[PDB]
Amino acid sequence: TRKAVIGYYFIPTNQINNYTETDTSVVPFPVSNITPAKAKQLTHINFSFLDINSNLECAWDPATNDAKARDVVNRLTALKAHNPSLRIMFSIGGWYYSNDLGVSHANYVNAVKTPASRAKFAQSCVRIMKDYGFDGVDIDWEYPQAAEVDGFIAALQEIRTLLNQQTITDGRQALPYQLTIAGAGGAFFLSRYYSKLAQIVAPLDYINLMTYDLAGPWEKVTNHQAALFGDAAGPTFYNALREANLGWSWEELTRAFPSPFSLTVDAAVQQHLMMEGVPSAKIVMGVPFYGRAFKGVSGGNGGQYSSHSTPGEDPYPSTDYWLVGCEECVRDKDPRIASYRQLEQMLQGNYGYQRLWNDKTKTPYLYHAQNGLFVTYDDAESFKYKAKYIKQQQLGGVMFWHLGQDNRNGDLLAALDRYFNAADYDDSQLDMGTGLRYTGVGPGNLPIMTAPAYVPGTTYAQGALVSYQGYVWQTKWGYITSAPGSDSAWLKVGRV
Amino acid sequence: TRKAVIGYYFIPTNQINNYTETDTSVVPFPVSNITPAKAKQLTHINFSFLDINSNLECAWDPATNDAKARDVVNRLTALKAHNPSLRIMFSIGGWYYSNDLGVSHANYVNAVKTPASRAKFAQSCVRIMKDYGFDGVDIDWEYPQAAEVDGFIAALQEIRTLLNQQTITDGRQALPYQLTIAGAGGAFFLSRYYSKLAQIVAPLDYINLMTYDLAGPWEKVTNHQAALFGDAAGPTFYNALREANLGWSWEELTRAFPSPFSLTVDAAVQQHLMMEGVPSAKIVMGVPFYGRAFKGVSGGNGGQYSSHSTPGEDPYPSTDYWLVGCEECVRDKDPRIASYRQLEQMLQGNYGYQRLWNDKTKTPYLYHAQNGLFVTYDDAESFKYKAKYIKQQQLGGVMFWHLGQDNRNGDLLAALDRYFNAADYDDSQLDMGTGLRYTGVGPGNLPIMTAPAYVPGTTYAQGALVSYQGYVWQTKWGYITSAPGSDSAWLKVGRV
Ligand SMILES: COc1ccc2cc3[n+](cc2c1OC)CCc1cc2c(cc1-3)OCO2
């Protein structure tokens, strides 16, 4: 089965309203830059972003010129001429619209609140899909809180029901309409809904993990934003999942959620696989096509794990564009983010950057020793290890933000496609290194074990193992006369 | 309010059937030893034990001569002529009948299963009470398991309903019929039903905690069986309450249930009071009128906290009675337990026993250096500290197992009554020592706290405190945009 390759196409309202394929000052990345070769390397394009309005319906931003929007979307769906498996999804939400303090947050909360509201919202999603010609629905609410999760789930179930009906009505068995979400890739936000992951992922084709932005100027210590594995020399974090609303025991929580821990891509993936009912095949690893830049860093680690002086707030609360060589940063008025395209040009421009490699995290970084700058980013090399991980862990594929940030040759997308599909690419000896793996164990990833069947009537000592109702259990203390499941003395430690 | 003084009167069936007040070889402790003075020192006698039979009704051991039982019970209820507050309860259960592997356990489990069975059982209880002249019902099931708790609770509620009706029907408003249970005094057994303590204690006048047998030959290290407070030099135990099905977060469990911990009387009491809806006035502290003995102990600490050679199985798997001086050990054919009466006699008989005192646990012990014997017990000195604790913690009173183990003058019973009621006893300056206190915090003992009201739309840093919906909450990490209770990010730390 082919791995998914899901690329975001983000276009702001003002670029739609002034869309041209002839002026990168106005539209830096028009649809024309998605060549047939690139269209064939994608399985999905997530057009972004739509929103939920005051009427609790899916909708375009009210300032959108609808004729221009339709034309942009038609250009994207025309790419299917080059790739009969390609789907143009649309994404609802994103940080700006749907974060707790964002402009439309209340509409997300209220849309999912009732049977009537969920039905109206779900219908509106399918209507948008059909009217503009999209191939599925992606929801990027960042992020539902605990009390909202059940309504969120029910809304997803309702969309699934309509989409399946629409597939049959439209003859689309060969390319069914799909439903995805963008999920948190770090434990703090994930702990909002982690306990209900199984019910969240049941109606979905994929959950696309945002396994990036794991570092940024809002943290006091510079770090890799998408480390695959952990580096003991780097910062560690409170494991927020041990506070999730799971109902588990102290021993269960402790063995599943070591704390502090390394905030890495492997952590997020393994934390999802620890839950029963979450299939590896639905998990999609997100990767960034951009880096995050920091100023005021010190030496001794190439800029890693240093204090810094980078403002954390949004929008960038300054006019000082200190990322030397970053013309896109001046255009966009933020030196703290740079596309891979721009970073490549900064590297070939002799601006004083060194490209370094951390072989524990398996990620590159830039250090500017003259000016004290650090940039965490991904490239075709880090993507080798991530793609091997996706294959070994039997994940559904890869997602990235976003297409406009690749270089003009499409090298990052071409790399991902190569690592999954090229017949002359062989990563059998790629060394995944000795960086820290996430070691938590939970009900969904218990080791297979054997043990004598439990016998009613028997008194068991501390540490005894038995099999019962399909699991292997271990006593936590002595003189146990109760059966596994029926008494808190037993810990589930294996699968039969 | 007068403190309860609840003494168990245990008599085996063979002693009931051959009852006599003229031959200690046959009945060691006849009721006639309960003089009018001793009668005024008690508030309750728990006659022990009745059972639940295969008809799922309260009943006497079927081997009981009924007339002889009636006569013993009359000897007890005649004592009420000397104390108009005295109640002669009867206790159903005990370890032998009701432990998981005991002879009647299935009858306890099945009696409480359905509305019909609970009604039949409860009416059984009230009928026995009235037929024999008892003043209330005590249930000593050691111990209901989690799936049985709800049924057990309903049975208690049913008994409560009937007893109240009987109160009004017999005009007993001045001395209403009562309902009590014996509860676990150590965390391992307590963990079976701890999460439902509120429901359990609601229908009761008292829950009588079995805060003894906290050490024994089944343990690998010698220790005090009823330490009031902890000794850091002593052994510590896994806190099983952290595995009870409470539904609390990792931080909540950890702050409520330190582990390892000192298995003490104070621990059991404070563990009960950490649960909301468990009033201190219903909690009764149990104390033992017997000691437990260990052989093969090393020197250097008076035999405390040493290895040993004592068998742990029941019945005693030997005829070697190695406890120099203990008559009763041969009579009853177990050298591991000895009444306070017998231990006093061993102390005055110049057998080589030294009485030592632990001023952290506030308890006595006996050491026998030449044959290496260790005895843990209580006496009138340890009872001073336990009685002051009962007063300071506003507990309901004291319970003890059992009357027939006090010395012939009843010094232990007299001591308890004195410490609670004697005008010429003054414990105002009694020093409770520096032993370890149990410091866990839970929903039932959250402190009053004060903090600024939560402000929606505000972002909070790690450690911030707000007031919201009746509690004070603290954030566990930073950049918190969610409301308290609404999120894994916030920890209940106090009450408004
Ligand atoms: C640590 O928590 C934070 C704090 C701040 C965060 C800010 C942003 N994101 C996650 C954040 C986050 O998630 C982990 C997602 C990507 C993004 C794009 C943006 C933007 C802000 C953000 O401004 C406009 O474009």
Ligand SMILES: COc1ccc2cc3[n+](cc2c1OC)CCc1cc2c(cc1-3)OCO2
């Ligand atoms: C270590 O686990 C055990 C193992 C064995 C145990 C045996 C007994 N108890 C706890 C035990 C225990 O609890 C900790 C409670 C008191 C008791 C009275 C008895 C009796 C046995 C027991 O026989 C009749 O009279």
